[PDB]
Design a protein around this motif. Structure first.
Motif: not given
Ligand SMILES: *[C@@H]1O[C@H](CO[C@H]2O[C@@H](C)[C@@H](O)[C@@H](O)[C@@H]2O)[C@@H](O[C@@H]2O[C@H](CO)[C@@H](O[C@@H]3O[C@H](CO[C@H]4O[C@H](CO)[C@@H](O)[C@H](O)[C@@H]4O[C@@H]4O[C@H](CO)[C@@H](O[C@@H]5O[C@H](CO)[C@H](O)[C@H](O)[C@H]5O)[C@H](O)[C@H]4NC(C)=O)[C@@H](O)[C@H](O[C@H]4O[C@H](CO)[C@@H](O)[C@H](O)[C@@H]4O[C@@H]4O[C@H](CO)[C@@H](O[C@@H]5O[C@H](CO)[C@H](O)[C@H](O)[C@H]5O)[C@H](O)[C@H]4NC(C)=O)[C@@H]3O)[C@H](O)[C@H]2NC(C)=O)[C@H](O)[C@H]1NC(C)=O
Lengths: 207, 34
Positions: A15-18, A73, A75, A197-199, B6-7, B9-10, B23-24, B27, B31
């Motif tokens: 859920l978190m891109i970090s 990934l 996604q 929203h924004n997870h 994070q915003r 990314f979503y 999309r990939n 992202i 990242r």
């Protein structure tokens, strides 16, 4: 011969891109005799090659435990791709294949509710701050607490529980010194789920 | 964590005007550069 167990990433990691989510394929009962273990990984059937095997470690019962970690990934996991781990070893009539993916079904947004301590609990030196999270789907979720911008760590969260409508709920209990609560300090329950929203969402709690 | 990242990314994950490859790509750029 050997056995295989396939594990998903932690809910927070996808859920978190970090974060970097990983799928882990664990092989136990690998013998000294036939120690060679080969891994093959596929995403929706297409072989992938970024998997990395960690140093194996012999076990108290004299077998090898071998682990292959596959970074994924965010996604792809969230969009339902299937991860297959293929394990080959000479003690097997054939390779063992294990598959995993995110649970199916339309995601449902968690409702987050903070609840102060019961007055009956004020006789104690520590009080319970409660965070109820309900109506979410899939059951994959992460909950944390903070105060002033820092992480309150003295908390425990129940596993998700299936509700009567097919969604899940859970409760997170943060325990703090009664004084801290009585002094007006503000606490926050952070919830991360695919259907938010924004997870990410946060709900505060204070006297 | 950086909420900005994070915003983004979503937003890229749910942008309906992107196909899987784009999309990939978006992202991954979010990242690495933040
Ligand atoms: C030898 O020795 C060895 C070792 O041991 C150890 O231990 C101890 C106790 C002692 O013993 C000593 O020795 C040492 O120390 C052994 O091994 C073993 O083996 C076993 C077998 O036998 C196994 O078991 C398994 O387990 C699992 C779990 O696991 C986990 O946990 C545990 C505890 O708790 C631990 O320990 C482990 O390790 C694990 O952990 C995990 O891990 C992972 C990976 O690593 C992780 O993850 C990761 O993480 C990271 C960070 O860190 C990141 O995050 C990433 O991302 C990720 O991934 C995690 O975290 C962890 N966790 C924790 C908590 O810790 C389980 O699960 C299993 O179970 C199963 O199986 C069984 C049988 O076998 C059964 O009984 C049960 O029931 C189950 O089943 C299942 O079920 C399901 C359902 O639910 C199914 O499916 C289904 O289907 C359906 C249809 O209808 C639907 O679809 C649904 O959905 C689904 O789900 C399935 O099929 C089934 N399965 C089967 C197979 O059947 C098991 O129990 C273990 O593991 C091991 N251990 C180890 C350590 O490894 C051996 O055994 C020996 N040998 C002799 C001979 O003796």
């Amino acid at each position: 011969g050997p056995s295989v167990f396939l594990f998903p990433p932690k809910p927070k990691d996808t859920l978190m891109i970090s974060r970097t989510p990983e799928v882990t394929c664990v092989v136990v009962d690998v013998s000294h005799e036939d120690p060679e273990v080969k891994f093959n990984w596929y995403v929706d059937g297409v072989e992938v090659h970024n998997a990395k095997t960690k140093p194996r470690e012999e076990q108290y019962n004299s077998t090898y435990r071998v682990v292959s970690v596959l970074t994924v990934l965010h996604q792809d996991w969230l969009n339902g791709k299937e991860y297959k781990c293929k394990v080959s070893n000479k003690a097997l009539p054939a390779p063992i294949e294990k598959t995993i993916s995110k649970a199916k079904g339309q995601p449902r947004e968690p409702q987050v509710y903070t609840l102060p301590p019961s007055r009956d609990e004020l006789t104690k030196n520590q009080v319970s701050l409660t965070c109820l999270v309900k109506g979410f789907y899939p059951s994959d979720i992460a909950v944390e607490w903070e105060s002033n911008g820092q992480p309150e760590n003295n908390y425990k969260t129940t596993p998700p529980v299936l509700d009567s409508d097919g969604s899940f709920f859970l409760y997170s209990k943060l325990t703090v010194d009664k004084s801290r609560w009585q002094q007006g300090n503000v606490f926050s329950c952070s919830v991360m789920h695919e259907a938010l929203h924004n997870h990410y969402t946060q709900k505060s709690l204070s006297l | 964590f950086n909420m900005q990242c994070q915003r983004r990314f979503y937003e890229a994950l749910h942008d309906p005007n992107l196909n899987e490859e784009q999309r990939n790509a978006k992202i991954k750029s979010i990242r690495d550069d933040c």
